[PDB]
Ligand SMILES: NS(=O)(=O)c1nnc(NS(=O)(=O)c2ccccc2)s1
């Protein structure tokens with residue numbers, strides 16, 4: 316099965332998922348001097364006041380926090396988007412060391428981790444249909460740097476011991492993702508793909524300029540998770556990030572100058 320090890324990592328994915336060598340794969344390095352300011356881009360509208368989290372799951376390559384998306388509770392609109400996108404899950408990618416872990420990079424700089432808030436376009440009726448469309452998903456990406464603790468993250472950090480191995484899940488209600496956002500919503504955007512198999516090219520990426528800071532202790536707890544199932548030999552869940560892919564015939568646009 317695919318994963319992040321030496322024998323089944325990103326460099327091998329293309330044998331089972333040939334779209335890995337596609338025209339708009341992600342992630343990609345954001346060159347801040349060649350990104351184009353676009354004054355036509357609108358501010359992001361993040362409406363998370365009615366979000367309903369349900370549970371947290373270790374899926375063997377990350378942990379997902381899942382939300383109820385049966386109704387327009389937590390939605391993303393505006394920015395480069397047309398239409399309403401519903402939040403369905405968030406997850407992180409992180410490194411074994413503080414100098415790596417993010418998927419996108421900024422002028423080749425890597426961050427300690429990257430938060431992905433995944434949303435789908437409600438005009439396609441369900442998530443499975445949305446992932447088959449070029450504008451079906453919108454993922455909000457937020458960088459994490461190591462510094463002062465993020466109070467909003469601690470609820471997540473404290474439950475990780477309950478889902479240490481693959482396939483474990485726990486109830487995770489009344490979590491407010493607003494506590495994970497930076498102060499500013501300035502962003503870069505480009506058309507891209509999921510960064511894990513099946514690597515579908517259905518994503519409008521929105522990457523926030525301002526990182527959030529988390530403490531060393533907080534990220535350390537991430538690194539104690541396991542890729543393996545219970546009873547299996549222990550493999551720590553670290554470096555679950557895909558390297559930057561070529562930009563090809565794409566333009567990254569900036570919401571700010
Ligand atoms: N890193 S990333 O692109 O946001 C994603 N990686 N895995 C994801 N999972 S997911 O959206 O629930 C998903 C699950 C099944 C098929 C397509 C997408 S999103």
Ligand SMILES: [Zn+2]
Nearest residue numbers: 406408431510
């Ligand atoms: Zn992701």
